[model samples]
Structure formats: C-alpha cells, structure tokens
Target chain A: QGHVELSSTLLKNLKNFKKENELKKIALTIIAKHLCDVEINNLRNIFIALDVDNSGTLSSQEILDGLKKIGPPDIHQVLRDQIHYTDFLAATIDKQTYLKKEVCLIPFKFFDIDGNGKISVEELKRIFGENPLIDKAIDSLLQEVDLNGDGEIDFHEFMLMMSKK
Target chain B: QGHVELSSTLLKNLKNFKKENELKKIALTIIAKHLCDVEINNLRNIFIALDVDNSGTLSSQEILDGLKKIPPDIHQVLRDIDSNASGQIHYTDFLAATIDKQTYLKKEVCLIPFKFFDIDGNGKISVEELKRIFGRDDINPLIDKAIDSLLQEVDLNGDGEIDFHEFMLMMSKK
Candidate 1:
C-alpha cells in the first residue's frame, strides 16, 4: 500500500459517496458485511486502528482524526454520528474489485445464518444484537423489505433489491 | 411479470441455464454488479418478511411451515437452487435460479467479456489470443485440444476466430 495514495484514495472514496435509498442502504448493508480479508483487509486494519475504544464503532473525533492523518468530504454522509463498521465498509467498498457475486451472496448468507433460505427479525437480533436502537433499525428495516407482508425475503425479492444499475 | 406461478417459472428459467464459458460467466457476473426500485420497495419488504427467523435466507422449511397452514412442491425449487445440494439456498444461487434472463444476458453486457477475451481489441478472438489468455503448463497439446473445440464449436466464419456475434450466440444457446 502506498501510504499516501492509499489514505488519499480512501478519503476520495469517502468524498464521492451520495445519499442512498433505504433498500439500497440495506443492500449495501448486506454488501458491507463482506469487507473481508479478500477485499478490505487494509480498510479493516485502518478501521480497527481508528476504533481506539474497540467499541466496534467510531466517534466523530476518531473519524476526524483519521481525516487529519489522511483526510473526507464529510463523515456525516455515512448517515450517523457514531459511524459503525459496516457503514464505513458500505461507503468504501472497491467497486472495481471482483465484488459482484460477493456483493450478492456474502451479505445474504451473513443474514441467512442458518442457510435456511429466509431471514427474519427474530434471526437478526442474534446478528445486530438486542439494542433499542438496533431493534428500531430491525423493525423499520423489516417494514421495508417484507413489502407484501408475507413475513420473509424471497429470492426474487432479494434480486429485485439489487436489480438496479 | 406474467406469472404461471413464480416457482414453476424458475424451474423453466433454471432449465434454461446452461454452463456458459468462462468469458460468459464473467460477463454476467459483471452485469450483476450494477443490477435494482417501488419494485425495489416490494423486494426489500418481502426479503425482510420471509427472513422470518430474522435470518437473511428463504428457508424451504420456512416455506413448508407457511404451507402447513395452507404449500411438493419445493424439491424442484430446491434442486434448482441448491446446485451443490446443500439442501438449503443462499442469495446468489437463489438469484441464479430465479433471475430473469434478460437482466444479465443482453448484447451490451456480452460485449464487455468479448472485449475481455479479445486481447488485441482489433475485433474478433484469435487462436493466438486464446493461447495467450489460456496459459497452462499441461503442454501445448492440452492447449490445442482446448483451443480446437472452442473454435470448432464457436468460430463459424472459417476465419478461425470468435467474432462478437459468435460469442453472443454461445452465451444465448440456452
């Protein structure tokens, strides 16, 4: 990693992001689960390093510090004051990498932990865990994806979420 | 949007799926990257709902449970989706089994992979180019056998190379 180029690039990726819709957010949430050894080990190292408290989220000051070291257009574009790991990942995913299938499968499998072919609010508690805020996210997120009120995400629906260019 | 029931439709779509060449697979994979909107809203809704266990998958067991109150009717869906027969499905394979063909198989989509294999980019895929892209140490015989078939089956013009039109036909053979 060319230190200057790498840091600058992260900031540029940060800068270039625009607002996303809810389903896009969730799809990206699915995708962001995949910033892994294969793709974002560098970002992972940086994220872990920036997360000084190891709280698994970054404070505004922490993000600001990283910017001073490297730099951003805006930390707030991530849609939160306490920037979570997955949020960082969604913002920074290298679009050009071998990421298409990874984008579709890894995120779906992460939530589909049992490999049962469905997801549910009951299942997600174990993943995002039980917090009032997270519970709110879970509930609202469900309201959006389960549109027919049938109570689970179908494969067709999943693809539909990703069907746009 | 015309439905003779979505599951049965997928078996048809599933049957339609063929083992595309490496370049073809790469092309669809590229297309999937940019692939989703009100319809987007509905998809997001059902995905959250069907994930009833709050896990992000569509369980055949989950579907069966839903049917006991009601759904056979899934084995086809299972084999069709679970190619490895994991007896369960994940997102990609599920989409692989279910996605409409045109979403990934259009001409502009195929064009990129043709360019990918074209090597020289002068138009058409040459035997020489194939040899370069397919570097292997199994020996030249292995290379010739491999090259011979692709050309035999795919290179129709007697120019002994794959034109973009030929590549598209191979991809659309299913």
Candidate 2:
C-alpha cells in the first residue's frame, strides 16, 4: 500500500462489485470463488506487502498499518480480523465478470476432490468438516443450482450459478 | 513439493545452506522476497495443498504430510525454517526458503530492496531508515541488534552509514 500503488481498478473492484439479482442473491457463496492469472498475481504483491510479517496471512493490524502509510485516501474497505490467501481471493475477486467457465473451475476442482467430475455433498463435507449446520447449508446450495435431479453439482451447474449475474 | 517441479538448484540451495551463515541467508532472503510470474503456482499451490484446513498457516503436522525426502530429517527441516520461532510456517517464510537464489545476484534485482531502505534517495542507508521500516516497536531490541550486526558486517569504512557500493558488496559472492 505504501510503495506499491493500489490500482484504481482494484479499489473499484472491491467497492464497486455489488450487483444483485434475485437468484444470485440466493446463492452468493456459490458465486464468489477462485483467482484468474493476472488478478491474483497483482493481488499477491499487495497481499505480501500488507502481510508485513510474511505470515502467509493478513491480520487487521497489518492491513490498517500498511494502508495507513499509503498516500491514497481511497480506502473504504478492509477486514478487521485475520484472513488466509483464499479468503482475500474469495472476498475481493470480481465474481460477476471474472467467473468465466475456466476461472470457476479452479474452485470447482477444489470441491471436486474425488475428481470423478462432480462435486458431491461428501466432498463438501470432507472439505468443510465438523460443522453440524453444514448439511442444511449444503442442501440449500445444491437446491439453488443442481439443475438436474442429480445430487452432485457438475461444472455445468456451477457455471450457471456463478455466471448468472 | 506441490507435484510441480522444484529445480534441482532449489533443493540444492536448501541442502547447501547453513544456519550459521547469516550473511548468505539474509542475502537470499532479500533477493527472493518478491514472487514473480513463473513461480506463483508452484509456491501458491504447495501452500494451498499443505494448508489442508484453510487456516492460512502451516504447522508441523501439515508440513510433515506435504513435504518429505531422504529420511529428510523433519526436525532438521523444521529448524531451518519456521522462523521467528512461532513453530508455524507462513507463506513468506516458505517462499523465501524455497525460491532459487542463484538468479537474483544481478545488480538490477539487488537495487529493488536497496531502494526500499534508502527511502530518502540518499546514497546511503541510515539507522533512521531502518528504524522506520516496520511499524511495531516491540521488536526494536531483539531485531534491532541484527540490523546493527548486518550494518557492521558490510559497513567497510568506519562510518556509521552504508552506501550502495558497500551494500552491493555484501549481496555478492566473496
């Protein structure tokens, strides 16, 4: 934030990304996901810079101090707690325009740990384990986007949910 | 470690490095500090693959599973990194330890970190510049001593400050 300039597009992307539709608002978690090549590289520098202590994560203290040193007054958003690499990506990536079928596939593959070409509740359970309330959340998520009667969400279903605007 | 190839050079650098070689260690640390286009996936993927729980940190358990070799002496691997004694491996520390160092000795690459400390554009690095580099004051004493030691190592002349030429000397092979 101090030496490296945070591009206006980056600033705009963070604050300006709030377009809402009835169906998408219903499944927003399914929407925000993986990083594209250029954006994540650009973000890696800023993330490392703010990381201050090189902890591979950002704490509220580092964020406040790093941005605090910047010459720009354009900072209107930042987190108050610790965030991992993906947390920043999930929160700041441009969900509406950036989630091309290719981009959506990065996270798709993550949740698709079994690699048989479908994301099942069991995979989600493995990744997001130990949460008792998880089944209800997963049920509703599959409810909004599973498209076919199949229990698993395939890439076709994922792209529809993410690209729905 | 990510199924992505680490050049033999990178593994060699790790094997070759000694904890006592503070000068060599810090020089490599400075040069490889920035991640570039070629390496984002290997380093990032390895971190992601090892992170397991999305906790944004790597612990001994996670590290053990993700990286192993040659009886690889996990404790020895453990000692060389996990810096700051937090017993955790952060992305910064991991990248610094893994990225190849032979490529960064060029004057062009060296100037980037040089200018970071020479903030005022003066030809020399000042104690004042070092003090202001970080925001926290709690580390002023333990960490401050290292700066003093590093300064003395390369200062060449008896002067309290160090100029670019002197700074460049330490960054190179002897």
Candidate 3:
C-alpha cells in the first residue's frame, strides 16, 4: 500500500486530540493526504447540526436527520428509495455485535451499476464525478480489493472488503 | 475532562477504519450512536461526497461546495479564510477555525435543531427536561461532560436551562 503524510505544521495543530494516540496519528495523516483542509471544517459544521442538544454525541435519529440535511445528493438519491432507518442502525452498530451483511449488500448493489455482480472503475467514476483525489483513491481501493486483479471487484471481493470493517 | 470508553464492538469497527483514524472515529461515533440502523447509508453518502477525488483526503473546495449545497450559509466565511492567495486551504487551518470559532451559526440555523429538541413546544430547554431527554443516568459520560461545558457557556441567569434568546447569544459568542 502507498502512504501519505501531513505537513509538519498540520501535525503540530493536532495537539488537542490525545485519546487514541496511534489511531489519531494514522487518521490525521490520511486525512491531510487525501482531504483539503476546508472539508474538515464543513464536516464539523454538519456534526454540530446533528448534535441538537449541544451534546457531543448524536442519537440514531439525529444521525439520520444530519445525513438528510447534509449528506451527498447523489448517494442520497440512490439510498432514498432503497433503504430505511432499521438498516442504518443494523449496519452502524458496534461491529462487535452485528456486522449486518445484508445492509452492506444494499450499497454493493447500488454501486454495481450494471448488475454485473462487481463494481467497475467506470461505475465508481460515475458515482464520484470528476475529482482527482477520488480517482487516485479508486485506484488504491481497487488495488486493495481487486485481489484477483481482474480490473474490478466482484460481490465476493466487495463483501470481503466491507467485512473487514 | 470526563472520559468515555468505546464499546469493544465500536473498537472493532475502529480497527477497520483504514485511514484518517481520529476524524473518522469522531464522525463515525457520532453517526453510529445517533443513527439507528439504516442511516449508515446517509453517513456513507457524506463520506463519498467528501472523498471527492476519493484519494480519501476531502478537498478544501469540495468542503466549500458541500457546505454551499447544505444550509447555514458559510461560503462568506470560507472565502475569507483563503487569505494566502494559495487557492488552497490546509487541513490544519480548517481544523483550527472549526475548533476555535465561537459564532457557529446564523439565528435561523440555530432555531431548527433547537425547536426539534424542545419537545414540549415550549420553545425552551430546561435542564430537567434536557436531562431526561439525554437520559442522564443512561447516557455516555462524554455527553454529560459536553453538556456541562455547554451549560457553563449557554445557561446564563443561573436558570439551569436555555431559551432561544440565550441559545442565540451563546451560539453567537461561541
């Protein structure tokens, strides 16, 4: 796998987060490498919107509401018709209790545009539109998932990837 | 200063997060706790949008564009931050502004969620009621800590509660 690092200045600003030392470092490095700075600000805004009570935590309903308010239009379009609250709870619950294999299938099918049982790079492009960063990640993601290197990920490969989470 | 432990189940998910661990954990923890089951769908959508170039680092432009697509009208603020003429903002600056900026909303945006949490149609959130809603006894310690911090900031007049006027003032100040 390839790697990306944060600017030293960026790393210095991260002093406030101390809980998950190893995890935070890894996470910040990836975020700095992949995302522009401003998006994280927007993300914080969305998070605030969902935290109705000013509590740092969000309830299940709040999460759904937040998503509706700020989630991506394209994914929302695909999901609005296909899934519901029950499915969300099942999938996001602590992975220790349940992984909700069925729920994972919903996205698998949605992204597998041709119903060919695998997601092609082209299909991913369609979903992401034109973005240089996404294009790079797609290549990296496929390299990780397309173990057989057939240039696409079959349902089995997709499941394997999702299950890893 | 309070601390909360992640459920082992949550820890398992954390292990699989692959990259951008802290932000993802913070974001996903909030999402998972508040979203019942299917709403992970929405969370994924948000993630996909942020991953504009999908190299997994969300773009500064993508963030601006995403916010413009949503509510709260922050484009003006975002543009101002492009002070260096670099045509790009660093993640560090963004995170700093997000953490320190006190005025987080316009009056209109603050009211929507305030109303939602006001349950009794009373247009106020009293500590007693908030305690019940947040289930003080059953909630995460971290949430209690957060509420305590907010109350310190928002609950003026020593009333142990918040009305819209106070809410707006608090939001504007912090």
Candidate 4:
C-alpha cells in the first residue's frame, strides 16, 4: 500500500501554530491522519473547552473531568463491560517496593530507564539509539513538569507525570 | 449598516458552557465557536499556550512570551513590536506586578488565595519570620535579586504592565 502523507503546507501550518491557521481544516486533517478508525472530530467541542486555561497540557483532573463531560452514559457501560477482559491482562506490582510518599519512588518505572529508578544522559543515549524517541519523550515530559523553569521536577510535577496517560 | 446575529451553534454552546453539562461537549464546542473568528481563535490559542501548566494561572514569563510568539516576524525585524511600548521587555518588572497573576482566575475554577509572604504557620508571615529568613541587616537587594528572574520574563507589552495572559504565557514557556 502507498503512504498518504501531510502536505508541507499542512505541516507548516501546524508548526506555526502560534498564529491563526484554519482550525477546522487542521482538526479534520489530523483526525483523518491519525484517528481514522475512530470518530475523532465528533468531540471537537470538548477539545476546545478543556484547553480552558489555554494551556496545551492537560492535568489528570482536567482529563478525567473532560472525559466525563463528553462521554455518553453508554460509554461507561461499555468500559464496565470490558473490565473483565482487562483484568485478565493486568498484573499487580508490590507497592511497598515500588511506591513511595503516595508517589512511585522509582523514577525509571515512569521514565522507562531499563525499567529502573534513575537515568542519566548516558543511560538515555543507550535507550534512544540514533533516532532519539526516548530523548524526545523525556523532553516533552520535562517540559510538562519543569513548572518553575529551574530545570527540576518537584512532587507536584512528579504527580502530574504519573497521572498522565 | 447592520450586525450579524449570533449563530444558533454559538447560542447553544454558550448555554452549554453556562449549564456545565456534558463538559466535554462544551469544551470542544467553545473552541469550535472560537474558530469561527480567526483573530479570536488566535487569541484563545495564544492564551492557552501561555497557561503552560494548564493550571489556568499566569506567571510572569508565560504572558510575555505568548504575545511575542503571536507577533509577525516583520514586526520583530522593524522593532515596532511594543509589548511594553518603551524599551525591550524585561523580567524584573514582570515579576513585581500582581495585576496579571491575580487576574488569572477562571469562573470554572475554585478561588485560590495564594499569596506571597505567607511563610509562617501563624496565619501570616511575621517580622520574626523575615528576620529568620533574611538577616536582621538590610536585605532588599537580595529580595530584588530573588525576584529578578521572574520579573525579567514577564515585562511583555513592553509597557510597565504585565497582565494575566502575559503571566500565563510565562508559565507555559517555563
């Protein structure tokens, strides 16, 4: 099969997101490109609202509350119906060993650093290889949690990271 | 000679927003309505981006940088872009003001009573606290330095004033 790609104009439009590019055009195109199997545009209304603070990041509370607002009653029923199947794939880790201060103590569990607790620049190098997906993920997560811009993540930031989907 | 009436979708969306029912639909719909007006949409996008933590609170740098991002490159080249209208924006003034940060309250969120100088457990900071934190000696310069980083980022509009949106943008960039 052939690959259908985003046009340069479209990419440019998205990159220049600080300006007033066409919203519906980008919205429709993005949904078609990434979420074609699902009806992504159906919830166009919801996406607009949760960005309420006009911030790009969504807190867990915001996400949860936003989902409840848009989701149909039947959606919850559907989720409930799927609980049994999900349980089959679920495994429980020992909380005492893994969790701390109502937060997970091991940084690597969340950071995906060899499924360990700490990561340095060297460890990141080994994981990302030449492509740098790991580094990008780290950058995005760091941006999310570095709330003070001092380049450090506090408890609140760590909590936000853990709560992310 | 005439003004166009509000669309049915806009009316309904407003109702949904006011009612607080089906928040997801309201969220999406509000943005959709904003898309109807390009400048307004731009304003909203810039505002959203400025509120970087998505907490709806604007810090000093968040507002300053967000406005800068929205301006055209030509304006930057001309140096005609005046967020402050005076000299270039500075972070010191941005951090000192309380107007913009206080204005970030959303009708949707609970009222936050966050304040500076609330360092002690006895309801508010005391003179003793100040002495303990800083020396009994003169320390205004150190306090100024501490606030310098925040003030430098927030002085957008290049005017003496940094507003809520400016603070939000500062937070987002951080």
Candidate 5:
C-alpha cells in the first residue's frame, strides 16, 4: 500500500517537471529565432552601410554621419567613441568569431587615450573621474588586463579583459 | 669585414623606422585621447540627458522631442520605422531607419552643417583651405582651442586639415 502511494506522487512530479522543461525549450527557441536571426542580421546590415568607406570598420565619425543623414536629433553625442562601435558590431557576428577574432577590441582603440599602444592610469582617471577608490579599482583592473606584468594595458590584453566581462 | 656590407643600410632603415613609429604613436595617442576623453563621453552625456523616462531606452517620440533642440529634419525617420504603427520607436528601430543596413545607407540628418563646412561643393573639406580660414580667426582663443582640438581629434590621416568624414566626426563630437 505504501509503495503504491509513492509511485503516483513521484510519477506526477516527474511528469510536471518534463512538461515545464518542454515549455522552456519552446519559449527559448522563439526568442532565439527572433533575436538571433531577425534582429542580428538587420543590425549587421545597418553597421556595414554606415561604414561609409566600406573599410569594414565603423568609426564614431562614420556613425555620426550616418545618423545625421537619417535626420535624427543631435544625439550624436550619444554615439561617441565611448560606445565601442564593436558593441554595435557584436550584434552581427557569431559568438565564435567574436571571441577568436578579438573583434571587440577594434573599437577599444578609441579608449587608448594616450595612444601609447596601451590604456594607462591617467586615461582611466579621465573617464572615471576623481573617485577615491579609483586607484584600488585600477589596480584590480590592471591585474586583470595587464598581462606580462606591465602596468599598462595593450590592445590584446584589453580585448582579453573586455571579452571576459 | 662582412659587417660593413649590412651596417649602413640596416642602421639607416632602423632610424627611419624609429622616426615613423614615433609619428604613428603621436597620431594614435591624439586620436585615442580625443575620442576617449572628449567625444565619446560628451555623446554619452547627451544620451543620458535624452533618456527622459530614465528607462535606459529612447523611444522615437522621446528622440523626436530631443531633436527639436537641434531642430533637425525628422519627417522621413518617423515614417520609416513606425512599421509596427507604434508611432514611437525602440533603439533598434531607430538604427534600422537611420542606416537601412538591409537595403542601403541613407544620409538624412544635417545637410546644413555639411554644406556649411564643405564651402566648396567638392563634397569634402580641404585641410589646406581650412588652414587659410583659421589662420585669420585668431581673435578668439576659445575658438582656436576648439579648432585645434577638432583638427587633432578628427584628422585620422595626420593631415594638417579635415575632410568630410573628419568633419562629421568633429561636428558630432561637438
């Protein structure tokens, strides 16, 4: 009698779990189709078109020019160099190439403020401003990105750091 | 000695390479600093200001209202992206309408600034001509710095002046 009682409850719970998993799968497929196929392809096209020189890279200037053509407001400031153009580019590429090609760092060059081939503490100061804890944060960030024990961050290291995030 | 054969040529080449590298470094630094410090940060501030509802997104109507300050021409954009008939738009819709990546690139925004800077209907700004113009406008120290910074930041090729592409970058940064 006790064994029979356990069978029905266990069976009912297993069935419920299976059903919920199936539902989750269906919902995820729909979302994946919508964002991955439709939105991503569309975003890629826009980015390539704005890459006026067709240099396969979209500069902030290029984006600004493209946006102006669209007659959008002077939100040009919004699309400035801080918004890694690759963030826009990332919407287009697959996860594999996005990681392997180090495409993320393409726009990070803009943040290499002093352009000494690496981002320095001084540049971080400019972006983050005079926070008391900024030094601590910088030290942590340097530890994360400054491979080879160098205090500065080169593009390769910067890309590695950004991708991890 | 065999060393004599390779020394002069190698040393000369090395010296030239070092000089070129220095120039490249300076150019890169100017660009990075300008973008990271001035242009990108300024643009972000503008977007934050426009995000009126603080929803971290800009609706079409929200953008429209913001553009009224710059007084841009926005008729085409509103008509194109309101495909869902929502009248308002999301950031994605806005991007699509602006660039039309699926079809072709559409240039809609500021013909006025473009024309004003182009000056010569050549569809580009000549650094040579720009220098002549700026040389005489030494009256305002503020304008001088603005011009210098703009030139420094947008001159991707290290030319003494700006072209239309560079001009657009400078204008947007402002």
Candidate 6:
C-alpha cells in the first residue's frame, strides 16, 4: 500500500508538469493569434483601403492624400520627425535599398527566420546575439517597437525595429 | 587575337557582378548596423543623455525636457499640444509624444519593426516582448482577457466588421 501511494504521488507531479506546459502553449497561442492575425491584418487593411487607385503602388503624394481621409493621425509626420526627413513611402523598406522585392522581403524575411514561416525567441536571440548588444539593449529596443499586445514581434514590428535605429 | 577580347569581357562581367553585390551590402548595412553593437552603443549614449535626473527610468518631465532640445522648423506643432504628459510615446501620440518630435519621431517611426514589435512565427506572444518594444501595456488586455473580449467584438451588429477604426477607438477608451 505504501509503495502504491508513492508511485501515485510521482504520477501526480508528472501530470502537473504537463499541465504547466499546456498552459504555456495556450498563452503563447493567444498572443500570436491577436498579433499576427488581428493587429497586423488591420495595418494591411489600412493600406488596401487607402490604395485608392489600386495601382498596386502608392506614390508619396498618394499616401499623403490617403492620410487626409484618416483625419490627420500624423503617422507620416511622426516618422519624418523620427528619421529627420519625411516621404509618403518613407516608412517603407524601399528607401534603404533600390529593389522593390527586397523591400517587400524585408518584412517577410524577418518573419521567416529558420527557413520556417514563424519565429521563436530562439531565432530572435540569434539575430540579436550576432551583434552582442542585443542582450543588454533588447529590453530598451523592444520597449519602443512591439505595438501589438502579443508577447512577440512580427515583420512589421521588425521593420519598426530597424526604422527606429 | 579575338581570344584576348573574350578574356577581357569575362573580367568586366565579374566586376559588375561584384559591384551589384556590394551595393546590396551597403544598403543592408545602413539598416543592419542598427541591430549590431555599434548602433546599440550609440543608443545607450542617447538614453544616458536623455535621462537628466539619473532616476534610471524616464518620467514624463524628463521626456518633455528632452524634447525642448529639438531644433525648430518642424511641420507639426508638438509644443502647443500634449497636455497630459502621459510619459508614453507611440505613433498614435502624434506630435505631443516628443519635443524634438522630429528626430524623436523619426527614430520611432523607423523602429516599428525589428526590435520592439516582433512576434514569433506560431503567433505566440510573451510579456518580455511587450516590455522590450515600449514598456507599457496598460492599453492591452491581459493575455486571457483579450481573447474573451475579442469574442464579444466579433459579433456583427456590435460593429460586426472588427475594423482598424474600431480597434483604434477601443484602444483610445483604454
């Protein structure tokens, strides 16, 4: 009888460990779901809604016009202030490189780290570790970047990550 | 004799390819450097310079104090607005978020991607991630509550469309 009780206690602890792991999964899932699917989706929708010409490309002036309807949120103005200059598409990755594909890839590449369509903390650690300050500086950096409440970063988040720099 | 020209042609092609690659690196470096030690060191200096009281945390007054240093000739008028001094800054804060709002705004505008708002591929989020990007989440619901509340917003007449405008209004109410 004593042996049976000891074995059952061991089993109970194992069960609890599994429960903790499951909870972690649930929490992480909820975060990603809202961040990737909702917040990011909203940003994409804003772009599509504003692309009045449906020309598949928004010129600097066109972007300004779109902002007019949005009631002067000043995203462009804020960015101009941050980087020390302004353009309708200044917030885009294209300003850094000449290639449109590369600019588009900027966000996609960040999200697709590890040759997979998703990112994990390990991958983030790898990117930040390459430069070393990522460890000490990441906290401050993240404080400025992560817009969505989800506990992780996305490509657009990564874009802002670079933009602030 | 023709062979001489062919060798020279091959050499020229190699040079062009090399140049193209270099251009790519040059472009990448401007942005990539930000993720490296060099940029972080610079940022450290910025933070130190901004932290006038040495309290180790930036208070609203400190941020306001920092803004006063910005140069004039900016498009937006930040000085007149921003009455609350929430000690928080984001794109949504508009001009009031900073005094130099120009440079401060530029840095923030650019930084929206890599460092602060990254999400893991599986769509999971961590509190640590939130802490890194901006240090405030009083606007966001606690992990569990956000999902529960989302279900309520999804029901149609309740603004059935869950659009960006609705989301902004919701965040504003917070």
Per-residue lDDT tens digits of candidate 6, residues B35-145?
333434443344445545432334445545665773232212223223334332222122112112222224332332222223342222233432323333333546536
Find the 10 residues in a row with the least total lDDT in model 1 chain A. Answer: A1-10
Q: Write the per-residue lDDT of candidate 4 for residues B115-172, one digit (tens) a residue.
A: 1112223333233332333333233766555334434545455543334455335433
TM-score, cand. 5: 0.23
Candidate 5: CAPRI quality band: incorrect
lDDT of 5 by residue, B113-143 (tens): 3443454567765654343333442236666
Residues A1-165 of candidate 4 have per-residue lDDT tens digits of: 011111112222222232321221222232233332222232233334544565543343553465455322422332232111111111111111111222233333333445433334444344345556766765664555566665545444443332221
Error of 2 at A156 (Å): 19
Worst-scoring 10-residue span by lDDT in model 3 chain B? B95-104
Error of 3 at B5 (Å): 40
Ordering by TM-score: 1, 2, 3, 5, 6, 4
- Find the number of clashing residue pairs for candidate 5: 10
DockQ of 5: 0.01
Instruction: Assess the local accuracy of residue B114 in candidate 6 as a C-alpha lDDT between 0 and 100.
Output: 25
TM-score of each: 0.45, 0.44, 0.30, 0.19, 0.23, 0.20
- Model 3 lDDT at residue A91: 23
Could you tell me the TM-score of chain A in candidate 1? 0.51
Q: Which ten residues in a row have the lowest lDDT in candidate 5 chain B?
A: B97-106
| Per-residue lDDT over B1-174 for candidate 2, one digit per residue giving the tens place of the 0 to 100 score | 567855554444445555424544544554454435364345555665676654444677777776652146446665655554556655545555565545566677667567655756787777765545543323346677876786678778958786878866776633
Off by over 4 Å in 5: A1-39, A42-94, A100-102, A163-165, B1-174
Name the weakest run of 10 consecutive residues (lDDT summed) in model 4 chain B.
B108-117
Give the higher-TM-score candidate: 3 or 6.
3
- Candidate maximizing TM-score: 1
Model 3 CA lDDT for position B143: 68
Q: Which stretches of candidate 6 lie over 4 Å from their true place?
A: A1-35, A72-164, B1-174
**Residue range A1-165, candidate 5, lDDT tens digits:** 101001111112212222332212222233323344443554456656676676766666776675465322323433441223344433223222232222334434545676677778776555455456777876776676677787887655653343231
Best by lDDT: 2
